[PDB]
Symmetry: D2
Subunit: 360 residues, 4 copies
């Protein structure tokens, strides 16, 4: 019942300013924080061996795209390794990102671990020494961070324990981040895996977000200095019933309106397996949804911004420009999408029409 300010007015301002810059109108996030074992899968789908150099080059390819992306990208999430890598001109990637008007973000979780006594459910680790790590990341150019929790819709999941534990650890992570001037992106991802319908996903998403914000309140989290990275509300990947983009948008926005306090600076949707075009079209429909939305509704896409780029690159240096062109096109599309001004056309290749879903 007695307040013990976790943050000073000066600290709140820094976090709030940072969070707003990331989701400034028309801007979104490029999520290039794939771990070594994660990006390896991507490079593997293009006959490119996973080496530090190939990874460096690939990240450079995306980070050094032409100035057309500048207005589209408010922030870029990187993996530890990439944060300390340099472009061919000797500039550290964080400097490259900043020079283009982007805020630098660092993924800080250490992956999921199984929750004993549950039906294949997990929580996420990475709190140990997080404070020292954040202080260091801050000094090295990072202003925000990301932590991913993963939940799954099934007959007995997500369980009460899974929801509570994941919500609690997100709160702990967000608390430590804010103590070090880093804006925490809270990511409670509910996988699209399964044959559940739209209303099932909406129901679960509402329960999960309600739990997340109660935990954030219990841990004294400054909402204005945070961002939310949730799954859009969609039917399961194996669901038979078909839904329109307007319906997905309505379910997504309704779920958010029922759980996310207006103080939250912005919502940066994960693409979660959706095709590049599907992700853009849904985000656009979301921003057009005829309901009051007190927070920025933009993107924090990983796969939905890299599909075509990876394919065009093929691991060959000569395809540099071609790869960057595809990326730029998705960044431009999504920039318009988070403004509800996106209108599909007929290009972006067929690679943008293919589902990037990956069962877990």
């Amino acid at each position: 019942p007695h307040s013990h300010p976790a943050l000073t007015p000066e600290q709140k301002k820094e976090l709030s300013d940072i969070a707003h810059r990331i989701v400034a109108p028309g801007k979104g996030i490029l999520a290039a924080d794939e771990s070594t074992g994660s990006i390896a899968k991507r490079l593997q789908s293009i006959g490119t061996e996973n080496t530090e150099e190939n990874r460096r080059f690939y990240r450079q390819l995306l980070l050094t795209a032409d100035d057309r992306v500048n207005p589209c990208i408010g922030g870029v999430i990187l993996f530890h390794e990439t944060l300390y890598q340099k472009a061919d001109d000797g500039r550290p990637f964080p400097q490259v990102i900043k020079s283009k008007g982007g805020v630098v973000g660092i993924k800080v979780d250490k992956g999921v671990v199984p929750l004993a006594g549950t039906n294949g459910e997990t929580t996420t680790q990475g709190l140990d020494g997080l404070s020292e790590r954040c202080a260091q990341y801050k000094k090295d150019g990072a202003d925000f961070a990301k932590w991913r929790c993963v939940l799954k819709i099934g007959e007995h999941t997500p369980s009460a324990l899974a929801i509570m534990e994941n919500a609690n650890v997100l709160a702990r992570y967000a608390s430590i981040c804010q103590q070090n001037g880093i804006v925490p992106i809270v990511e409670p991802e509910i996988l699209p895996d399964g044959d559940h319908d739209l209303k099932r996903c909406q129901y679960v998403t509402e329960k999960v977000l309600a739990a997340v914000y109660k935990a954030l309140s219990d841990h004294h989290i400054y909402l204005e200095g945070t961002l939310l990275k949730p799954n859009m509300v969609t039917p399961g990947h194996a669901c038979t019933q078909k839904y329109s983009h307007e319906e997905i948008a309505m379910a997504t926005v309704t779920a958010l309106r029922r759980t996310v306090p207006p103080a939250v600076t912005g919502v940066t949707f994960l693409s979660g397996g959706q095709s590049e075009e599907e992700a853009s079209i849904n985000l656009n429909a979301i921003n057009k949804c005829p309901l009051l939305k007190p927070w920025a509704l933009t993107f924090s896409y990983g796969r939905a911004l890299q599909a075509s780029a990876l394919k065009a690159w093929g691991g060959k240096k000569e395809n540099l420009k071609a790869a960057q062109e595809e990326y730029v096109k998705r960044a431009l599309a999504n920039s318009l999408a988070c403004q509800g001004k996106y209108t599909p056309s007929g290009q972006a290749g067929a690679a943008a029409s293919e589902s990037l879903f990956i069962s877990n």
Copy 2:
């Protein structure tokens, strides 16, 4: 992890529609739901015996004020007794209210009870047979209800128990109301008693509201079909430090923005002891606050709408027109206030 729809789309539309009508632009709530024991002091302060007749006459006086109040009053909260009384012309009060464009509300709690093991804290009773009562009230004209929980800021309060228990009973009440087509006004009032400052109130308000909404979620409450009646965020009555209306407005709006989901149709502030003018000036400041507010920010005033009217009446039928005039003036004042157009004569520091 499985949904068992508490309400059908039709039930949802009904609740949502009722909620929106009560807090439509420029409209607020007249809280005239004082119980016999509660209206006792009011009448006592003016030397008027607490009889059913005087209560009926007083309530009639307010409910029949001239049409100038119509666009100001979106809803009227009544005490059980009043819901079944009639005006002189024989018209049931519920009918009077509705003919003036207002929705009829009914207070359904049965007062506070002490929570053992706490420092004078309480919870609220009234759930027994509530479903049947709501069905009967609905049939008899009421479309929304009110339930009051009381919390206090002290050295060890509100405690975890008080916050959790009051949030839970509010949720039960809300659930029962929605099952019977009644829009529940959730009122978690944090008393202004004490010498605590503005920051203290804001902090406690944020924690209480966060608890309230988690409980509403756990009980599957349809937020669009609800209204919130909280205290504005203000320093304690005995606080020596002084603040401006802009500051209490900033603290109030900031606290609501950090806890109240956008889906909540509206916030109807209680005046909780503030004077008529102060309550109007604060509501006005709240609506002009330079922050995004996704819900209607209006009033659900009891004392702040009756103070002058009660005094002018003095328990004398002769002063009917004089009394009503005072009420009308406050109704007009607050209608402008909830629009941020009243005149009586972001900050990271929150």
Copy 3:
């Protein structure tokens, strides 16, 4: 983090003494608190009109059995109506019970109500004015009370909400009782309905009881001044897999040892549909289970003590002694059972 004693040492002593008397060695509880609507089925099953007199007679029949039941009965739970009735000799039933060495109990809940948004789940009502009711019941002879919550094992039940809400209302009821010198019997009954196996019941029972005691703790309940009336851990009534009494006893004792603090004075099992013999055999096996049990493990039987007595009666006054004889037999059988002295004549797998 701060304490505000809900009870004084004197109040604690009173409650603890009462709870211990009810479950003194070899003693159990006769649960005859069937409401008018509940006893109606019982009387109807034997073709007897459900009249106040017939209910009075049947209750008299049970309460005035010979002294052989005295050492068997530590307490008797009555329904409101019965607490105020008299035997043929003009003595009020509370006096009859007391003169036989029994403590008088009163059921105070007002039945279950549906929890909206759940798959047919419920919570229980009865808190309104409970304090005044308890104060009056205390004056009229009752020293303990009973409140029944009902949970069901199913595809999606008991849900998180159902567990939390029922646990919370039990805590509120317990709190109010103790403030009035009444020992509360906490009854969180998990129905045997379904085809679930023993393991599932043990799991649900462990989760439900952990919730109950956490709620009791949050509400500052004095455990030494309470009793627990849970379901024994058994397979569902329609489970195809079969088990032995020893397995039922092991599952039950294990569940309790993992959730019931040693401070709880006693566990008084409900029979929940089990036959008279079965209920006695399981209670005996529970008391013979080779695990440490820090609380009395006795009975609070309704049907398990009345089945044959009601049948031998049949609504005929000339079958009085015959019916009483059947009751005495089950009282004797269960008195031995709660001592592990009743004969019908790898614990890590739990």
Copy 4:
């Protein structure tokens, strides 16, 4: 509402057997799990340089004490470093402990960290990579572990957050341990710092323990395969009012009876600053308390078993036997104390709570 067994009957048996061996009648735990920084303080009090060799020599001093300690020590908690050190004869310390009938334990937390928004409260870290660490420790001789959470009694503490969070991390720690055949010792220490009285400590201890077991329930922890290491219930260090050992025992036992399920195999009290003799007398009183106690009530003492030994040693090899004698004496005293048979002689209304 559906069970998804975290442990098989075989895994449960192993955990239960381990937990019971540790707190078998007359046995307690030697807590010698002081980290480098922690032991540095102990070594400084006797003007001894904090080098790995001195630490090894010190730990060796305690672990190789004569066979009189065998029936007194059911378990020994070691810091990571020590688990991998060897006695002069080349025997790994875990082997030394095992040969003397003791179960080997390993401290696995990585210290406390500040909880933002609280009045100086903390939670504890160390879950990262914990499963892998437990699998490795198990393989390397350890059968139980220890994780310490710290709470403080003050005007606004322990807060609801501190209680909830610390109870939650303990549950996570316990869950990971049991998945690896390691019996977790749950240690929710409520510091004795402050001027609060006996009833205040009992109140807080009761609320904390209630939170701890609800958390363990939510995380599906097998209680029979765990131990509890709580603070005894005593007045604050700065409390002006005095209390008898009988009252300390009554308050302690009452708090436990009201919160600790009988399924919990044993309670191993921390000495938390009490003198060697004080910790022994209180433990004896606790065991003599006239209330039903369904779990073993023994010790898990660090300072209360090493104070005199450390001083008698002074960092001089010459005083080895003298230092071991002091340790053995406390081991004997406490062995008698956890049986309520302790006496200064040697080795021969509860409603107000």
